[PDB]
Design a protein around this ligand. Sequence first.
Ligand SMILES: C[As](C)(=O)[O-]
Ligand SMILES: C[As](C)(=O)[O-]
Ligand SMILES: [Cl-]
Ligand SMILES: [Cl-]
Ligand code: NA
Ligand code: NA
Ligand code: NA
Ligand code: NA
Ligand code: NA
Lengths: 110, 83
Amino acid sequence: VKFPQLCKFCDVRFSTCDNQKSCMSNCSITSICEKPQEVCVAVWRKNDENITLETVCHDPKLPYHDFILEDAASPKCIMKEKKKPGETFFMCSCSSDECNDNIIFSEEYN
Amino acid sequence: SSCPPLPDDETVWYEYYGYVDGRHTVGDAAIKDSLENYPPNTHARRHCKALDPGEFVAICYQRRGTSESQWQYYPRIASCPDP
Ligand SMILES: C[As](C)(=O)[O-]
Ligand SMILES: C[As](C)(=O)[O-]
Ligand SMILES: [Cl-]
Ligand SMILES: [Cl-]
Ligand code: NA
Ligand code: NA
Ligand code: NA
Ligand code: NA
Ligand code: NA
């Protein structure tokens, strides 16, 4: 039977992650997801004013920020860019413990 | 591989049950081991002393294929209010 997994779960934080092939979440909160079926998510967003990194659990049967978590079965968080007006937006999901702690932007790093 | 009872205070106490499926369903009373510790998959139910049926807040979580177990908490937990 599916048990809940562990994820970084700081919600939305300001971030200094920028211009890197990978970033650590710098999130000090690891949580067990409320629901067994939830997976980990990281969302990085940059606009003219701020950079944020969001870390949550989320059920991949539901969209998140208007996108489907097609990568939920991955063990690693590989960020994928979504085209959005007025910001640069990257998101990943993954289903190993604390997998949204190690956020990978460059293909080169897996 | 076990978890000690959670520390408590004037705001809170805990009961312990086996995890079933989800954060709502209450399982059997959890059984302590010889060192008075709870086994992996124990579900900790908190009661705020100021106030409610109780709410599960943590699982004694054993990592994947390891022998290390620690309490892991559900998201966004807020402290019980002071009495
Ligand atoms: C980020 As959620 C647990 O409300 O799907
Ligand atoms: C987590 As995805 C496939 O919407 O970048
Ligand atoms: Cl964009
Ligand atoms: Cl476990
Ligand atoms: Na859109
Ligand atoms: Na843009
Ligand atoms: Na973008
Ligand atoms: Na509960
Ligand atoms: Na919750």
